[PDB]
Amino acid sequence: MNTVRSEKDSMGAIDVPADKLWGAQTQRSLEHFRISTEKMPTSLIHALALTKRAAAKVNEDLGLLSEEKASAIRQAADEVLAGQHDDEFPLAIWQTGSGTQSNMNMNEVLANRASELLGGVRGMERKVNPNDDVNKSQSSNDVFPTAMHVAALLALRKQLIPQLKTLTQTLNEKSRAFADIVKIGRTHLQDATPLTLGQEISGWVAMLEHNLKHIEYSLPHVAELALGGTAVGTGLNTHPEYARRVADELAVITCAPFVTAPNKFEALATCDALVQAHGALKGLAASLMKIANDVRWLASGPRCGIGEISIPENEPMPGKVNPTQCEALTMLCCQVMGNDVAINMGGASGNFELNVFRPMVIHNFLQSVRLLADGMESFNKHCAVGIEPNRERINQLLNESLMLVTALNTHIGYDKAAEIAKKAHKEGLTLKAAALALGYLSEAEFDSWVRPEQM
Template identity: 50%
Template sequence: MNKKRKSYRIEKDILGKVKIPINKYWGAQTERSKINFKIGQNGSMPIEIIYAISIIKKAAAISNFELGILSEYKKNLIVKVCDEIIDRKLDDQFPLVIWQTGSGTHTNMNINEVISNRSHVIMGNKLESEINRFIHPNDDVNMSQSSNDVFSTSMHIAAYTMLKNFTIPSIENLKSCLEQKSYLFKNIVKIGRTHLMDAVPITLGQEFSGYASQIKKGLYSLKNTLNHLSELPIGGTAVGTGLNAPKGYDIKVINYIKKITNIPFKISENKFESIANHDSIVETHSSIKQLAISLIKISNDIRFLSSGPRSGIGEIFIPENEPGSSIMPGKINPTQCESIIMVCMNIIGNDVSISIAGSSGNYELNVCKPLIISKLLESSRLLSESCHSFNINCINGIKPNHHRIKELLNNSLMLVTALNTHIGYEKSAKIARCAYINNSTLKEESIRLGYLTNDEFDKIVNPSKMV
């Protein structure tokens, strides 16, 4: 009779023995974290952090080899496994949540253990109890490093990469589309509004130019944060002093990180600051929040301008993407506007979390690192995807409702503002008030009150000359 194959193996750490699933590469420290922090249904450590730490491990192994403290064979094994992780071949080996130690040590050890045990298998061995590792997770994979400088560095790598490859391009595309609409709508004169009430005329293009300018300035602010974000504290080890890291290690490892990522990273101006605090991410997220605030304003304007179709403002048409009601047939809602507004509200909430977490550095270490980076990456990803969706499913398809724009413009009492410099504020106000009370036109009241002739009124009150 065949014996049933065990579903686990035994590994040891300084606290004793731990059962590990037989098909997993992680080790005792990972399993302890998995057991002790069963918190949250969707709180996994962002995969971008896993890839970023793997880039650091790869760069560190090469640097340690070149500095003569790691053998070439061990270096090659570590690099090979790191490449597998970066290529997404081992995604199921990183089970830990962000709600763990505030330094991210558990995730750093998770990766160290996976690299160690995967190297063991690559060498032709099996994962069994009491593994005699050739590649040690601490002595070899974590050589010249501490979780404190590794995780801090990975935060910057992951954030910069996300912003560069996804967030900034999406925002730039939205800005370009808004600028294009501004140009296309430049000659469409409409009524302006302040305090939600009728104001003097403006062109639809001018209105959209304001939206484009908001996004442009937010994008400028976001890009300006990249310089601070490009500073990496790797080589500072536990508290920034560089204890146990050889001379020249930080320069080498950052040069390799630059080559792998094609991003101009540099050594932190002050490693103590970069490990103990995360003001750079606070700064970056503040710019993301600025964009979120702008997008809420823009989205609300667009859904109000398109409201109706017959009983609202209805000055623009937005794309009809899907039915809007389960009970009202034919109803279409501004769903893209509503979606991006909710995303931006979430981003503002994330900014509060990052602000509080960023202030929670104690002495030489911030102890909210996983929370800070998870919120930054979530906001960056959501902003990227929502801007893309908003752009292609709403902004790109906006068209003016010429008939409604003209109707509302010609019916506005605030065109009377053009008379101020000709007959004075008091007489102009009387014309507007009488037109409102009598439900008549400005022209009719101007003539009835004897202030202007028909031709004089037409010459002065010309909306196209008021913009």
């Protein structure tokens, strides 16, 4: 729409597209921060709306906001949550480090929309004020950190954790099924003593179980909300019960154990909870990286690789099955590792009463949660559930290896066993061929003595 609407702020009047619900400040920012393409994530946008919704409810309970104005704001917020205004937040991540502009973006959209809900119009003659009504008892300084933690905790709890548990269950099932399949071990990439495929996969399982616990230990710190500290953490200009009540309201509507941060100065001056929580994520990224690599190497082939297992072929060189799911997963794992550095740099750069590296920190954090959750979901349904062992290939490899000589020790002694091993290795023979060439035992004895199942 070409038609503009004149809105204004302390700096003056500016044209805003008539069909949009934002105001003067959102428009100024839009024109001042034309940097790249990254905008606020939908999960962050919704957490911002949830925060405003909680503040409105509590402001009402304290008699700071009229029931009508408060219910209108609460209703406009629900529409945002319902995904009806996704097009109303055009601000880039690369804005003011406190996220002030996005806070104002939400204030204006909810003010203009709540006005209409009250039978009013959007624009300078609206019924609900962005600052006085929607931003009542708040500050960008304590609102953005609160929205960051709301989004972070819900994404970990609702997206990440469930997917982690599912993959764990799948691998655990595979572990039990392939428990009797003995295969050759590999240390340093060299042939080593045997182990069952099931024991090897149980390693992947335990890795995932351990990761779940570390992620869980990081949750309580993220559950601490900064809401109530206002500008510098002192809580100047708020009701003494506000902080506690707003945390309770949030916990109630989200069903997540949110609590008000015991120390508001720590809450506003740092992103510590997120720096630490992401530490657990880079840990999971390292574990997934290893699992994905094992999968693609074990499935490499079909003729000139390892080929011990087969994975589902998901897209259309006959046996050439590229491990695409493993490639997407390993790629996003590198991404999480980089995001950690950006997060650490931003987290270590706080100055005095406020850390102003927040949009970047939440941008990286929520991306890692999406990548990990979706990555595990994809890898699980398109690869993990269909992993199958190539029994013929596994057996062939076992029998062609020199690593089984050890079973001859108790029968013919170490020196003769080592001799057979040396002969086979020098002559390019199998242990059985070398053993028979030497005449140290019959084929029947070899077949009876070397049972890889007793490894």
